[model samples]
Target: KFSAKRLPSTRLGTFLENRVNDFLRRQNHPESGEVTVRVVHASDKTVEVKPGMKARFVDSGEMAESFPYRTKALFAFEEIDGVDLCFFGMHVQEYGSDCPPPNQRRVYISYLDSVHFFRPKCLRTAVYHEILIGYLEYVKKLGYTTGHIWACPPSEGDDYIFHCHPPDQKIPKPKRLQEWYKKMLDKAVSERIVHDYKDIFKQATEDRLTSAKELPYFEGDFWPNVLEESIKESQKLYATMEKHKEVFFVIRLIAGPAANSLPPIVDPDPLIPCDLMDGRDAFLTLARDRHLEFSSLRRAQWSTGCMLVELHTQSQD
Candidate 1:
């Protein structure tokens, strides 16, 4: 079964609708038509996503997930316009000059969730880099000052809902994950993207730590009960991301000098064709890893959600 199977289509449609109707619109006061239609109504229309081009938002109409809104991620391979590519999303509070503090902005980069864009260690890593680059550059352009990235390890239970893991086992361990993130952040430093990181999670855990004024919209007087309870709830093992008690929190921070400065990642080329066939024929068509297209065969598992229950993938861009 070279393992790749057609992904069931219905699951995606539901995610698409909620992300569109609830998350994007009815919540995100849809912008003016000149800007709104192209961005708002257009998302519902059939759009083309070709190979070798840039990854764009099919639509990111709104935000409503309480304080510190999180990112919107697309799971599974979306065969949109017949081009297989990875798509992910996030939302930030755009507090423009209308606020009491003049201009203020924040983004809860809950997670950048990975995808199969060529699937491989170094390969998947490369695509992950591209999207992060794609996202940060845009975030910087918009003048978002605070963007906090949460590295909570994705759990098996949520795999179907988020579809984040590469076609492999869960990220080795909290230790390995800490290193992976450190390496990425270190690169950000090397590139002078975000020179130094300040660990707010640790700042909290070193004491139950981290901040913000103004609540987004919550329910009621229960805010009093919830706030006090949330603090004590932190006493639990996994309440916060960083290490605590006997745990060692990953450095627990994502800092930046804004995206307006750094160089852009090369736009991802499309996933090329990789045919699975016979000996003589396979021998003749020895696929060279140009654009990491051959990653489809790196592992015998492609329907990652089903495969997550079963086992585990990559390539470069």
Candidate 2:
């Protein structure tokens, strides 16, 4: 089993911890926060995170052999009293369909199983980037080949759909996510790097421009390789094109931000509303107009303000 392999030295832990510290220091209020992160072995008491935020990189001994995923991280804000903000957690799964030749084994990084209520302003904010880089570096060093991020096929399934990022949310599109990865890794270092699929695999045998004839027949917009129906169905539909090669997730190599190749928190756009009630009221209005029953409408949670409304699905659908 993979567990038989010994965990590497604290070098990775220190590397990641320093990266987060650098990002924190580079921020406006760096002086106030502190950090403690590591790849835990069997068991060891690590100091508690002071008033500052905490990002953990873990592949506990129990993980390697028993789990299909070799690594996981809980990247979150500090927990004081009983309240905690879990920004998100990433999973690096053992090799699968995307794996290449045996010589260069690749690990799949599921961008995350994440929460939406709190979206960072600048989008270029650094905590999660460092967490991801560190974990990817640690895993590659732990003996796999490089990392691969293939967006999970989007589905109506409540739990497993779109683990890379929320489907209809405006947070970040998969293409945008890949661009950001290139941006972050560019600023820091390049010993290990990220690459977009076009760079590596140009001769796409599967012509995604047209349907393979196996998928359900339909009429829709196929621009940029994303299948389109209604304006609302397009985002998830975009995710559906990954296998068809219109691609939702692909990767690395470049060096720059997303909005720009710069950093250090930009003030949020004044245009977007930050209040929860603003969203709830609008949701109620929409629900009333559509005549959707309270049960059918379910939770009208809005993300990035009133822009993204996710009506979670129940199993029967």
Candidate 3:
């Protein structure tokens, strides 16, 4: 008989201790912990981060991988009380700013997991409208300083990472194949959520939803006309959000706006057109080769060495 067994606890502890120590030293920088910051990777890799403390928790597993190393690394950073404020959503951005960390030179994003795209269509596109609304609610629930990332790329330095499957995609690793099985389970769960969307919608807006940023889908307690009111409320609410510079770039996939040639999604004001970076080459490569549609892509660097990853997340208030 054959069965998968857990690796020895000593091996696991050694792995954890080594990584956590590395994570903690990374946080003991010269300019960290002045102001609150939360960093997120928002990538399709098993990225990890640590705050002032030596702990972690799996805040992300959005990508397809064979093991849980990536999730475990970043997990510790998610629970840090204040020291982790510099790292939030995807990558870091507050080095020279008011919340600079202690050490600037001690920065890096290790790719514990390699990301490969094989999905012809990204889930974000298949249910774009619904996902948008769902994400807004989800973000609100998570306190808004988080979001999701799309795919994976060959290199870690690259700003954007997304995954696209060919019409007939193939996954090589046995573990990855098993991951697909788990994905099916997740898909079923997602499907059930989709099926009960009406109820879900009701719950999201039962109490007037309030946020620092106006959401993309801000409709009333109904459909059609409800959508109109929702968008109006969202726009009105967004009017009061804080203004910050946005980084922009483009992905070359047939996505929500680019594919149909819409005015490059300006719903979020502080948004930097991600596709605008480096003339959209990264975006195009993923589309033609990975079968992915570019809805949106981003690259963020953390203040600490922590690499935070999230989906359907926004920055904190």
Candidate 4:
């Protein structure tokens, strides 16, 4: 459990209080709506803003943790240039074939860009499409549009699938052998057996691509090796994520004052819904009805109005 420290009569608090007071004073029209947000000490008496508005007491400690705040505002997220920039809370869950049941082995997505509906296809498509577009845009700014493809064997039971961007998704790849993949992955021991099989071992040994028969058959060392390899891959993935330290979640929002025209982001002069195979068949065939690739797609949900967007996942420190 974590506990926050409380400080009394600190100059830092005084400074923040002053700034907040100044912000409150700058609002010229007090008639449009008389709404007030007051920050009081945990022990202070409650202050009411309006009649019938029940005054509530809040622990500033928790508020400080949630918003752009700090003893030193060096790393706090603050409104900048008329934009209400705030570090929105996010949750991410990692699932794989051998993960624990119920929660593990499945990418748990919540409300934003989520996969929970009669047509769950749209949710997967939406999340994937957005990530791809955002990733491409982020990379294009660096003058490169090329990426490689390395598919993880599908873990459908775990509900574990990956985000396949355009071009990468277009390249020919072997589809998962449903029966074999499932049977060998129903349990941890079986999962270890299959993943450590000669075919899988060969793929790793000869990155240049070779026949599955050429590789050595599974030995006791195979499972350990597979575990090690997966760990290494996970570290690599985390390293890539660390590069985008500012990003707590992999998503972007686009909305307008009006409804109905909601869609994924695209270039102004770009081709109009061509048959570009972007590996995002889910999104293309389901959500936006066009080929638009993205970088990554975790689980998320969408609002009906097309304005509010939020994602659902577990939290990471």
| lDDT of every predicted structure (CA atoms) | 0.31, 0.35, 0.24, 0.22
Candidate 2 structure quality by residue, lDDT tens digits, 1-317:
11101112245456666766676667766232444343322111111211111111113221111112223222333221222223333433343222222212345553354444232334324566766776655544444433445443334433321122334444555666556656655543554444323421221233242222212211111321232222222234334443445332233323234312323222111121223112123433543555432111112121211212221111013
Which residue pairs overlap in candidate 2's backbone?
Answer: 183-256, 194-252, 194-253, 195-251, 195-252, 196-251, 196-252
TM-score of 4: 0.19
Tens-digit lDDT track for model 3 on 1-317? 01001111222223333433343345464322222111122222221122211111113422111111111111112112222311111221111111112211111222212122211223212222222233323322222222222122333233222233222323234444334323432443454421221112232244244531112111110122333343442433333221110110111112233223322221121222232112224433634464433222111112122122211112222
* Candidate 2 segments whose C-alpha is farther than 4 A from its true place: 1-15, 30-32, 35-74, 79-83, 95-104, 116-120, 152-171, 181-200, 203-243, 246-317
Instruction: Point to the candidate with the largest TM-score.
Output: 1
Error of 4 at 243 (Å): 32
Lowest lDDT block of 10, candidate 2: 49-58
Give the candidate number with the greatest lDDT.
2
| Tens-place lDDT digits, model 1, residues 168-229 | 44444556665666666676556555445445444344443322112222212122233344
User: Model 4 misses residue 211 by how many Å?
Assistant: 19
lDDT, candidate 3, equals 0.24
Position 49, candidate 4: lDDT = 19
The local lDDT score (0 to 100) that residue 108 gets in candidate 1 is: 41
What TM-score would candidate 3 get against the native?
0.19
Per-residue lDDT for 1-317 in model 4, tens only? 11011112233223333433343346442321111111111111111111111111113221111111000110001122222111111111222222222111222121111122212232323223223233223322222212111233333322221122322233222344223322322331232211121233232333342222121111121222333343442333334324422212211111123212333222222111212111223222433432222322211212111111110111111
Query: Which scores higher on TM-score, 2 or 3?
Result: 2
Model 2 TM: 0.41
lDDT of 2 at 113: 44
